[PDB]
Design a protein around this nucleic acid. Structure first.
Ligand SMILES: [Zn+2]
Ligand SMILES: [Zn+2]
Lengths: 148, 99, 85, 94, 76, 83, 108, 109, 93, 99, 82
DNA sequence: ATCGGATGTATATATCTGACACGTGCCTGGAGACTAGGGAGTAATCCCCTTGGCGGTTAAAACGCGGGGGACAGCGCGTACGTGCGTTTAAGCGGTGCTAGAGCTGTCTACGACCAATTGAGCGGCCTCGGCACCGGGATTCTCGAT
DNA sequence: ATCGAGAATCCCGGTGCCGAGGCCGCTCAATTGGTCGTAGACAGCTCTAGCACCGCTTAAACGCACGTACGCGCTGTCCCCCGCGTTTTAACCGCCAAGGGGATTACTCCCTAGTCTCCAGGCACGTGTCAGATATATACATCCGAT
């Protein structure tokens, strides 16, 4: 119903104005399933890394938040091993007016600098906040071992 | 030639008679119909046990009797004998029901 | 009081409003979105992000939500969108 | 050091910040909020307990809490509170 | 020697360990070979957890010993 | 099978009898409408809670226990019907 | 919702679900407490607190102060019809009374 | 006592004590219930019931009847001072009201 | 069928003990049942509250005594406390 | 020549002033002494926390304010502007405090 | 031992209470009735407060006891605990 | 000041019926014996804060006086309500018939209680800086006697 | 109808203080993970009582006509709270000082919940009978016009 039309305007607006360094598209014929690709930001130790995200839209959109999952493995303080994403927008700050482009750019920003207020995993949290070099080269070796 | 009482004697006779008695003072059928109407306003297709209707009638009668006692006291306070709607309003306002 | 067609449309639906209501935050959009949000969303304006439950309680019990002036303008300006909806 | 005493200070402060982003609350009003929350919680829990004991049950299911809220609160607040509670529990389960 | 670690899904991974090896290095090798975070793994052997500062010989792990892998996931 | 305007069933002599039991001697002409309004309000208040009780228990017939419990909640305990 | 996280964030509330659940279980209310009761109770409490606090803040802003004092709480509670009906029998410490003077007493 | 007879007989009461104990335990009033509370509660209940029954019987005898109907109970409750305060907010079915008329309404001389 | 309990026979016993002549009708018996149940609920609730107030997890006799003092008016409370103390003293030995 | 306000035009000013303030209106020491007297009448050798005395003052002041409001309402109902004791007992009896 | 402290509730205090309550003119006999009703109310509250204090085997009447007695009487108070 | 209807109320006697008191079968809840462990009583110790007091200083109470507005009593009126009677209306009582739904019974499946480890949310303690209390000055607006 | 003098109240700006919000360290309870005895959801059956209808009363409701008594307004009288100025008094703030008792911890012990087993107290049901409601016929208390 209305969710189909809303997602149609979403595809039209993202196609006419493609986001920089992030591009999404329909993984299959079913309209709710999506595949997106993101490139590692320049001001990050994620250089040379391309990441794929799968997106599921609930029946009521944007009246309920959508779901996103990491196809690949990325070493981030706010990301689980299996691919979960911990952002206050996805579960606490979701609003119908909010759109799909800015959640992707917010994920990119989080990849640029993580948020240590609500650590998904404490181990990586104090790896990040105890010393910079630790996190830097471990995230490096992670992005060469998996992304490349 | 006909014998008619002074206005205010048979009223006192009624006061004395009714206070001694204890039967219900409202007809059963109209009250039952009113209760059914008020109930069907909220939810449709209700069935009422007889005890429920009797209890509701008892509660309504007791409440009205108490309110009338308080209204009479207010009216006598205002140096009158007749009860008036403003007296009922004042009694309810003091009791805190209307708020 | 906007003659423009595009600005009139609902910020969420992207078509012409049906029986609109005006929020205390001076935001205008169609009622079904408000019903859906109050049942499921955070009961706050998506942009303003400040609770409006107290205003909704005051306006709802007397059905003050309906706005006649914004009602008349939308069909007198754009009848066919109302008819198709 | 004195013993710990639990209170609803942090949560009420968070809700206040959510509503008004730049307004603080005094200590006395803070205690008044704490007492009001305790009083309403006691009222709802007691009503739910009596209502669940009336039907020869043993568990205080969310149905009992919903009915207790619908009984205690006035006309509009009851409707809004029921809507909020149902939305919260539906979000929680899924 | 060589040991086996059985995950929660029943998968068994072979590990090349020595009694004098350090726990952190072994966990890093497990992370490299599998992707599971080093310290997020919980190793169960005869109902006793394994400490980072302890050695393999302290808990008496022999050859062809089977350990249990536990995942500790928080958040979401 | 709906019902209409049955508040007229509380006749003028009935309200007069209730007032006489109360202990009044002279009754003004406008008391009856006020009494009818007050009675309707009180009945609505009690019936709402009784219907809530009977609806929670997944039933379809209000009983004496529901009305007694509603009265007890409202602050007017009633004896002579169980509970 | 996805499991393996704090209960208060799964429901999107700010009031503590776990504390309410413990209070219900050990509060001598019933032998067993369902798993859906504390979430509902916490949501209701949060809604009521937000409703009080919004009006309190509005009154404080109207009174030129930026800190809520019990007088603002008295004003907010008594000015609203529904909340006044709910808190009919409750006295707020140091709140005064609403400004109201009878029409007959006013000078002619 | 001898600890050989029934609990109600042992305590010298007429109201049951075991039933009161079960009601206290299953009533969700406390996690634990002492072994002396039900006896005290039964004693208080019996005393109050005895007083009201005595007053109702006196009122019935003064009316020349051999059965306590609710009217006699209502008269006994209202006429007494402390019992009226205890049950101020209680409605007795078919209880009527106390007879009184304000002095002003009485006929003039 | 199912069994429903009541305080009917005990009230009748007390009536025979006080007035050995007067009988009691059905509706008066129901009224007495309701009164006994109401008083029991009031006293039990007050005792449970007092027990919870001092972080106590049990209901001893002194909680019942304090609840009786709180609830009933003066003379009735004094007589009830005397009767309860007598019953407890006689029962314990 | 001297300027004097008409009778009753400064009482309204007092009403407007006192309904705006929130502080207590009874002096602390006399009320504390009265509370101590009543308590020592009940049970001797007692000590009071200051918060208890403050709570007692708040409760007593609120109760008296409500009672005087209802008394003024009754006095107005009797077609007067002066409150008399009979108004106080009428209001108290209607509220159910003495019956 | 103390006696005759009810006079501490002076005439201006009752006058101020009436002025807050919304009273324009006060008769001369109000004060005695006000003192009587205040004494009755205070006695009623203090009885329950002292009973609560004596039950817990204490000797000081904390504010918690007073607020609890007020809640029992039907005059719930917020601010001092509970 | 009573007198004589005239009405209504209370009192004495037969009567007959349905509700109350009592006996019966029995079964489910109450009672008796044994165990275990946690909740409560009790001893010893800390330091919080509550009672007591003293000096000043000043806001609040006590007192008295002129008087003006309000409480209270008396009188007139005309309109609304009580009282009674003939007439129309539907409550009440009995008897019948239909069935929706309360109440009980048997299965078993999923929701909730208990138990152990563990660690992060929340609580106690400290600190500092800005909002509010307060003071002094001026501008604004009710108020009343005199026109 | 108003002009004007006098007094209370609001606006504004500057100065100072303390408590409210944020930060840091830490002890305990909330979360996860698993297991297990049972609460009640559901389907099926039973039969009670609620709903609907009909007929015949006969008590209660209705509308009308008349009289009268009382609610209300007007007038007057007087007296008692009110507003204001002066004097007496203790409330209140700040300070110091002691020790009573609330609050805490550790130890022990005994009170009670749980379990099993057995048995009689109280309940559903059925039956006999007299307490009281009803009808009929007098004795008396009380009301009302008028002496
Ligand atoms: Zn829309
Ligand atoms: Zn907005």
């Amino acid at each position: 119903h209305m969710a189909l039309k809303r997602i149609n305007k979403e595809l039209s607006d993202l196609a006419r104005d493609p986001p920089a360094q992030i591009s999404a598209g329909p993984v299959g014929d079913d309209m709710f399933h999506w595949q997106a690709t993101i490139m590692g930001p320049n001001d990050s130790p994620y250089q040379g890394g391309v990441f794929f995200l799968t997106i599921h839209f609930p029946t009521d959109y944007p009246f309920k938040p959508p779901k996103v999952a990491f196809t690949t493995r990325i070493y981030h303080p706010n990301i689980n091993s299996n691919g979960s994403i911990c952002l206050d927008i996805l579960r606490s700050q979701w609003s119908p007016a909010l759109t799909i482009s800015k959640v992707l750019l917010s994920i990119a920003s989080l990849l640029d600098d993580p948020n240590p207020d609500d650590p998904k995993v404490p181990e990586i949290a104090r790896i990040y906040k105890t010393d910079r070099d630790k996190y830097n080269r471990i995230s490096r070796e992670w992005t060469q071992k998996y992304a490349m | 030639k006909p014998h008619r009482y002074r206005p205010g004697t048979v009223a006192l006779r009624e006061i004395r008679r009714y206070q001694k008695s204890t039967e219900l003072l409202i007809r059963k059928l109209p009250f039952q119909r009113l209760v059914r109407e008020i109930a069907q306003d909220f939810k449709t297709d209700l069935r009422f046990q007889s005890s429920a209707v009797m209890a509701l009638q008892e509660a309504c009668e007791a409440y009205l009797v108490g309110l009338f006692e308080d209204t009479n006291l207010c009216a006598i306070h205002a140096k009158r004998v007749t009860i008036m709607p403003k007296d009922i309003q004042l009694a309810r306002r003091i009791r805190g029901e209307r708020a | 009081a906007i003659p423009s067609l595009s600005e009139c449309q609902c910020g969420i639906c992207m078509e012409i409003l049906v029986e609109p209501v005006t929020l205390p935050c001076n935001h205008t959009l169609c009622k079904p979105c408000f019903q859906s949000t109050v049942e499921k969303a955070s009961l706050c304006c998506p942009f303003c992000r400040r609770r409006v439950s107290s205003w909704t309680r005051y306006h709802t019990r007397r059905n003050s939500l309906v706005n006649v002036e914004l009602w008349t303008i939308i069909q007198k300006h754009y009848p066919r969108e109302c008819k198709l909806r | 050091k004195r013993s710990r005493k639990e209170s609803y200070s942090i949560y009420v402060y968070k809700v206040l910040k959510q509503v008004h982003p730049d307004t603080g609350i005094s200590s006395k009003a803070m205690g008044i909020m704490n007492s009001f929350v305790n009083d309403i919680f006691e009222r709802i829990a007691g009503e739910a307990s009596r209502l669940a004991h009336y039907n020869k049950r043993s568990t205080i299911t969310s149905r009992e809490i919903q009915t207790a809220v619908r009984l205690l609160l006035p006309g509009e607040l009851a409707k809004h509170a029921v809507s909020e509670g149902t939305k919260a529990v539906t979000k929680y389960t899924s | 020697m060589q040991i086996f670690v059985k995950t929660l899904t029943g998968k068994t991974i072979t590990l090349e360990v020595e009694p004098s090896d350090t726990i952190e290095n072994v966990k890093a090798k497990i992370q490299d070979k599998e992707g599971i975070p080093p310290d997020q793994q919980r190793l169960i052997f005869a109902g006793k957890q394994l400490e980072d500062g302890r050695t393999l010989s302290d808990y008496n792990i022999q050859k062809e010993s089977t350990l249990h892998l536990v995942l500790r996931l928080r958040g979401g | 099978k709906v019902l209409r305007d049955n508040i007229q069933g509380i006749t003028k002599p009935a309200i007069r009898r209730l007032a006489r039991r109360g202990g009044v001697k002279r009754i003004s002409g406008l008391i009856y409408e006020e009494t009818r309004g007050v009675l309707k309000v009180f009945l609505e208040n009690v019936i709402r809670d009784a219907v809530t009780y009977t609806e929670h228990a997944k039933r379809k017939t209000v009983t004496a226990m529901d009305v007694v419990y509603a009265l007890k909640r409202q602050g007017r305990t009633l004896y002579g019907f169980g509970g | 919702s996805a499991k393996a996280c704090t209960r208060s964030s799964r429901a999107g509330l700010q009031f503590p679900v776990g504390r309410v659940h413990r209070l219900l279980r050990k509060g001598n209310y019933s032998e067993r407490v369902g798993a859906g009761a504390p979430v509902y109770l916490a949501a209701v409490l949060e809604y009521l607190t937000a409703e009080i606090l919004e009006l309190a803040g509005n009154a404080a802003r109207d009174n030129k102060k930026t800190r809520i004092i019990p007088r603002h709480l008295q004003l907010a509670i008594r000015n609203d019809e529904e909340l006044n009906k709910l808190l009919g029998r409750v006295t707020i410490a140091q709140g005064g009374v609403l400004p109201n003077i009878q029409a007959v007493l006013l000078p002619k």
